[PDB]
Structure of YbaB:
Amino acid sequence: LGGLMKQAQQMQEKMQKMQEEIAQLEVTGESGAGLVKITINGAHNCRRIDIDPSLMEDDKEMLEDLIAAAFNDAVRRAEELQKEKMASVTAG
Amino acid sequence: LGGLMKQAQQMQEKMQKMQEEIAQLEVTGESGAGLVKITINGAHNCRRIDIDPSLMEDDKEMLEDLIAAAFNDAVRRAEELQKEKMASVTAG
C-alpha cells in the first residue's frame, strides 16, 4: 500500500472524486404540475428548460414565477440527491 | 474567555455563521445583454426573474435557452461572490 498518511491522503482524494461524480447526475425540478420543468446537475448547472407552450401567451409575470419555482424545486431535489447518493455509496 | 478547545469551537461556529451570512447576499445573472436577468442568493434560491417582453413572442426554444444561460451566469457570479467576500472578510 504505502503507509498511513498516504492511505489517508488517498481516502480524501477518492472521497472528493466520488462527491464530484455524484454532482454530475441530473435532477429535474418542476412547478405547476409540470408546467415548467428544469434540469440541473449537482453543481447547479442548468442543462435544459421545458416551458409549456400555454405559458407563452399570458402575463410574463406568471411565467417568471413558475420558472423561479421550478428552479428552487430542482435545487432542493439536487440537494436531496447529493445526500442520499453519498449515504448510499458509504454503505456503512 | 474559556480555554483553547472552547475558543476553537467558537471560531468554527462563527466561521460557519459568516459563511451563511455571505450566502444570503444576492447576485443577478443575465443572458442576451440583459434580455433575461435572474436573481439568486448564495444557497442558489431564485428570488426573481425578469424576462424581456420581446421574448414572449417567438420560439419558446430561444427563451428556454436564454433562461438556462441566465441561471448559469447567476450561479458563476454567486460562486465568485462567496469566494471574494470570504477572502475580504478574512483580512489576512
Remarks:
- The two ends of chain B are 23 Å apart (CA to CA).
- The interface with chain A takes residues 43-51, 53, 56, 60, 63-64, 67-68, 71-72, 75 of chain B (CB under 8 Å).
